[PDB]
């Protein structure tokens, strides 16, 4: 999963995607797809 993981104890992938505009550019992408 990496950034898109459900684990309470996540890895640095999540923190990297945050600072790299990936967890945000994917949340908007998913929401835009839902639209």
């Amino acid at each position: 999963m990496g950034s898109l993981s459900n684990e309470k104890f996540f890895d640095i992938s999540l923190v990297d995607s945050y600072l790299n505009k990936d967890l945000k550019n994917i949340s908007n992408k998913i929401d835009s797809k839902l639209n």
């Binding site: 999963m1 990496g2 950034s3 898109l4 459900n6 992938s13 994917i26 992408k29 998913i30 797809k33 839902l34």
Partner: protein, 300 residues
């Protein structure tokens, strides 16, 4: 070339084996390939091995580990007795049946994913089937795999947001399901333990198909009667059945109602006498043993 010929030679055909020739544990199946020499070759100590077998050996069957050793001898035992166990099983004409009603392993059946619904049970069996693995080679299954699985992150970071985006925004109960399937789907192409060393079916003990009746001059045989021996004079402790020695196999004997009085009389010498038994069924366990169930037919 000489190398090509050697690979196909009869000595090459025997698979490498270093298992103890003197084993005192539990024996469930043959461990060494029986070697046989003809009478003419035996007269000349010729067995097709590297060196002549000592003339003291009068048997025509042996089992060996090494063609030669640092002690300048062949490591062999002049015995071939597992063949008589197989041939005695054939004479009892009891087909081996699955107690779980599984498909016949010797037929190419069209199977489906009925049992594949346990993808998370067996995909993790590769890392969890490590009962007897080294403390660090098993630990190499953690970093080596992590990198391989971590190389599919981009593929699963796009497929999951294109095939099941709702789960990524609602719950991971289904996401975990898509993960187990993803790896297996991307692993079926891979070759992890592509060769399975588990025993296939009977292991070669019997190739008889159930169903056939035994015609005899006295009519069709309905119950198979086989001479045997009772080993213990007291039922197996914690078990409601005694043990018998029938045709090179140890079976569990169930008595009609009572135990014959020769038991108490004979005592610990009960094995000195031969009784007649009926072989109810024969099953195969995963350890490679045969579970033979018998019945002490007593003159009545």
């Amino acid at each position: 070339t000489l190398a090509e010929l050697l690979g196909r030679s009869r000595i090459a055909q025997v698979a490498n084996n270093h298992k103890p020739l003197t084993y005192t544990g539990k024996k469930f199946h043959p461990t060494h390939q029986i070697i046989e020499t003809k009478p003419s070759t035996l007269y000349r100590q010729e067995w097709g091995l590297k060196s002549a077998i000592p003339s003291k050996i009068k048997s025509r069957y042996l089992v060996y580990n090494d063609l030669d050793t640092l002690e300048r001898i062949t490591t062999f035992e002049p015995r071939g007795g597992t063949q008589w166990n197989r041939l005695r099983f054939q004479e009892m004409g009891v087909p081996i049946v699955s107690n779980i009603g599984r498909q016949n392993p010797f037929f190419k059946y069209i199977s489906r994913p009925e049992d594949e619904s346990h993808a998370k049970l067996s995909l993790f069996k590769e890392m969890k089937g490590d009962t007897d693995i080294s403390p660090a080679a098993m630990k190499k299954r953690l970093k080596k795999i992590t990198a391989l699985i971590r190389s599919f992150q981009d593929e699963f970071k796009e497929w999951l947001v294109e095939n099941h985006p709702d789960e990524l925004k609602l719950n991971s109960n289904k996401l975990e399901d898509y993960v187990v399937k993803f790896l297996n789907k991307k692993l079926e192409t891979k070759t992890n333990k592509k060769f399975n060393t588990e025993i296939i079916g009977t292991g070669g003990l019997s190739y008889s198909l159930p169903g056939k009746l035994k015609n005899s001059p006295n009519g069709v045989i309905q119950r198979t009667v086989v001479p045997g021996r009772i080993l213990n004079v007291v039922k197996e402790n914690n078990d409601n059945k005694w043990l018998a020695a029938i045709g090179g196999f140890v079976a569990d004997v169930v008595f009609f109602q009572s135990p014959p009085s020769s038991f108490n009389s004979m005592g610990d010498f009960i094995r000195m006498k031969t009784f007649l038994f009926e072989i109810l069924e024969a099953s195969m366990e995963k350890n490679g043993s045969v579970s033979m169930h018998a019945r002490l037919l007593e003159p009545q």
